[PDB]
């Protein structure tokens, strides 16, 4: 096989709310594992001991190419944590480039609230930069090792489809899928132009939000609030997460636009699902949300706009098939904005590490209706964009 982009199209699967994973093989002979794709962290780690929620796990003793680094590691996330033993082994991506890399691998020996009951993944691929790797930035992340040992160009792109994913009639109702194109950009995954925002600093995929509109109405906050203490693009986060103050203004504005003031507060807090009769979800009463991002030239921005189909997430197995139920998937953060699957499922997202920038284009698979579509538009003249970034005061 050639490792061409067409072979990589559709190489992700997932269950809604449980991340997206790619198949990988580790060790010699290869052991196949499904690996969550996480642009919000920088460690490659795999279940390496039994766990009630693991269908399979990595067995270092079965691999003649395993090398023990004789160092432990602990990694905490916003939700979940694990610890394990560092080592290196040969790693491949069967529907990725046609190459084999010696990479650092954390062999997970204990964990808490990390693995998800029934999820079909057994490990995590942290795609961000060494600065946020544990135990420290000397543990070269997977994508760095891939680029350094092979000729793969230093970029990847993600198309997360959500419920826009072609399924058989007989597949489980919450299955989602998508593509990770490693080494470039595949033109079948998007429509219109790609628009780029600078990667502000290489640690997380940090970006700068310069304006927010709901229903085309400016939220009118000081733009520093949008990026307090950072804004990141994160495939391993489900929601659009917003700083408290921004969250509260967002909910107020969404309620006002849609006349849902009387919806219970538990709904807005993600503690209750809203249910309508199947087929009758009134999408049109809910507003579009736009984030304007810093552009590539002086005083220039562009915006990405998502629909209620992105921020009201369908939940299966909670009511009769006669009803469609949704979770409000915009939530509060005390660690900055996270553009999770709620944002990424509208767009093809290019993590152009070589040029220190993130591209967005309308996704060919985003969920929308006959009246509205997700959008990426620009250019706009915007002043004082550099002032939008947070700095330690």
């Amino acid at each position: 096989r050639r490792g061409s982009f067409v072979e990589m199209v559709d190489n992700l699967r997932g269950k809604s709310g449980q991340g997206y994973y790619v198949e990988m093989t580790v060790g010699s002979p290869p052991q196949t594992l499904n690996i969550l794709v996480d642009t919000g962290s920088s460690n490659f780690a795999v279940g390496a001991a039994p766990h009630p929620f693991l269908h399979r796990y990595y067995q270092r003793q079965l691999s003649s190419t395993y090398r023990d680094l004789r160092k432990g590691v602990y990694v905490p996330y916003t939700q979940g944590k694990w610890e394990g033993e560092l080592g290196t082994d040969l790693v491949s991506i069967p529907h990725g480039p046609n190459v084999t890399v010696r990479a650092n691998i954390a062999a997970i020996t204990e964990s808490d609230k990390f693995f998800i009951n029934g999820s079909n993944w057994e490990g995590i691929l942290g795609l961000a930069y060494a600065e946020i790797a544990r135990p420290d930035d000397s543990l070269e992340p997977f994508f760095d090792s891939l680029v350094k040992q092979t000729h793969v160009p230093n970029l990847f792109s993600l198309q997360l489809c959500g419920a826009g994913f072609p399924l058989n009639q007989s597949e489980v109702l919450a299955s989602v899928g998508g593509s990770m194109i490693i080494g470039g950009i595949d033109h079948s995954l998007y429509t219109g132009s790609l628009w780029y925002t600078p990667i502000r600093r290489e640690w997380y995929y940090e970006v700068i939000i310069v304006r927010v509109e709901i229903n085309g109405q400016d939220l009118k906050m000081d733009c520093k609030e949008y990026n307090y203490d950072k804004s990141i693009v994160d495939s391993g986060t489900t929601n659009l997460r917003l700083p408290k103050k921004v969250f509260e203004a967002a909910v107020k504005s969404i309620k006002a636009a849609s006349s849902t003031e009387k919806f219970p507060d538990g709904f807005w807090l993600g503690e209750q699902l809203v249910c309508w009769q199947a087929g009758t979800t009134p999408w049109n009463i809910f507003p579009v949300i736009s984030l304007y991002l810093m552009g590539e030239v002086t005083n220039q921005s562009f915006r990405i706009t998502i629909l209620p189909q992105q921020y009201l997430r369908p939940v299966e197995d909670v009511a009769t098939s006669q009803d469609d139920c949704y979770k409000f998937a915009i939530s509060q953060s005390s660690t900055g904005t996270v553009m999770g699957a709620v944002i990424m499922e509208g767009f093809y997202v290019v993590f152009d590490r070589a040029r220190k920038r993130i591209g967005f284009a309308v996704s060919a698979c985003h969920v929308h209706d006959e009246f509205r579509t997700a959008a990426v538009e620009g250019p706009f003249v915007t002043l004082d964009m550099e002032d939008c970034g947070y700095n330690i005061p």
Partner: peptide
């Protein structure tokens, strides 16, 4: 006595991937 939309408990069902530093 019944009606749409209605609200039921639930939620969670999320991933939230690394803590800073």
């Amino acid at each position: 006595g019944g009606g749409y939309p209605y609200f039921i408990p639930x939620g969670x069902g999320e991933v939230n991937x690394v803590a800073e530093x």
